[PDB]
């Protein structure tokens, strides 16, 4: 509970063409249109994902993702090693530097080679990500109720970057701390 609220801004260099970022870089929604997004090496081309601008190399840090799934979409939240594969079919799993949870209506899972289905007391509106770089914890909780969701144990050898994904029109997320 000594996790330091962090500023997150979504990096428009990284965002899949199917994600629309807000002017303030605090929100994203799944867009009906592929944008004519410059295909620079930092940009996801298949995974409908976006990174934060600023990575973490130490300490304890925490941020909150508010999730709105209007019509059976999904949202993915977590952290990636900064050398995560961005081009092609990415497998979201620890082995490939992804520590993330996927939320849909009636469906939450921790992503790995062997995804873990999680049944919660409530459908999370808000997911708190609490990262302890020093120990190697990625903790997910319901940011309103503090209900535990999942904890990954990780060995960080590189910078880690807050990670977000959306699938399906009417799906969106917004950031706070």
Residue numbers in the entry: 305 to 481
Provide excerpts from the study:
As observed with MID2, the crystal structure of TRIM10 also provided insights into the conformational equilibrium of the loops lining the putative substrate-binding pocket. This structure was determined in a crystal form with three molecules in the asymmetric unit, and comparison of the different chains revealed a varying conformation of the Phe411 side chain, which modulates the shape of the binding site. An arginine at the center of the pocket, Arg406 on β-strand 6, is positioned in such a way that its guanidinium group is poised for both electrostatic and cation-π interactions with potential substrates or small-molecule ligands. This central arginine is flanked by several hydrophobic residues, including a tryptophan (Trp471 at the C terminus of β-strand 12) and the above-mentioned Phe411. Due to the generally shallow nature of the PRYSPRY substrate-binding pockets, small conformational changes at the periphery can significantly affect the results from common druggability predictors or pocket size calculations. For example, CASTp identified a pocket with a solvent-accessible area of 142 Å2 and a solvent-accessible volume of 150 Å3 for the putative substrate-binding site in chain C, but detected only a very small pocket at the same site in chains A and B (solvent-accessible volumes of 4 and 8 Å3, respectively). Some feature an arginine facing the central region of the pocket, though contributed by different structural segments (e.g. MID1, MID2, or TRIM10), indicating a potential interaction with side-chain carboxylates or C-terminal peptides as observed for the TRIM7-2C complex.
The tripartite motif (TRIM) proteins form one of the largest subfamilies of RING-type E3 ubiquitin ligases, comprising more than 80 members. TRIM family members typically contain a RING domain usually catalyzing ubiquitin transfer; one or two B-box domains mediating protein–protein interactions; and a large coiled-coil domain region, which is involved in self-association or oligomerization with other TRIM E3-ligase proteins. About two-thirds of human TRIM proteins feature a PRYSPRY domain, also known as the B30.2 domain, in their C-terminal region. All characterized family members shared the same overall PRYSPRY twisted β-sandwich fold consisting of a 7-stranded and a 6-stranded antiparallel β-sheet.
